[PDB]
Ligand binder design. Sequence first.
Ligand SMILES: Nc1ncnc2c1ncn2[C@@H]1O[C@H](COP(=O)(O)OP(=O)(O)OP(=O)(O)O)[C@@H](O)[C@H]1O
Length: 74
Amino acid sequence: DGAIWQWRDDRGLWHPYNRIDSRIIEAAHQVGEDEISLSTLGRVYTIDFNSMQQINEDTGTARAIQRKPNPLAN
Ligand SMILES: Nc1ncnc2c1ncn2[C@@H]1O[C@H](COP(=O)(O)OP(=O)(O)OP(=O)(O)O)[C@@H](O)[C@H]1O
């Protein structure tokens, strides 16, 4: 839980992923995965670390993602 990942909405604001989704993204990022799949809200997303984007695999919409360190000690 060393990171808080965020995604960018259409109006340009950043939203934190939930703790579990941040954990999933972070774990894949840490080991050098190129991409992972994430399901939330019944939607299927590819998290593409080569381009640092979240891609909706049905609509083709790509959104920026970014990582913030989590200060909180285990
Ligand atoms: N990781 C996420 N968690 C929650 N909401 C998200 C996430 N990514 C996108 N959204 C929101 O979900 C909606 C759909 O975004 P998404 O990128 O899935 O597809 P889209 O092609 O923009 O939209 P639509 O399905 O309406 O054509 C938008 O309101 C967007 O801000």
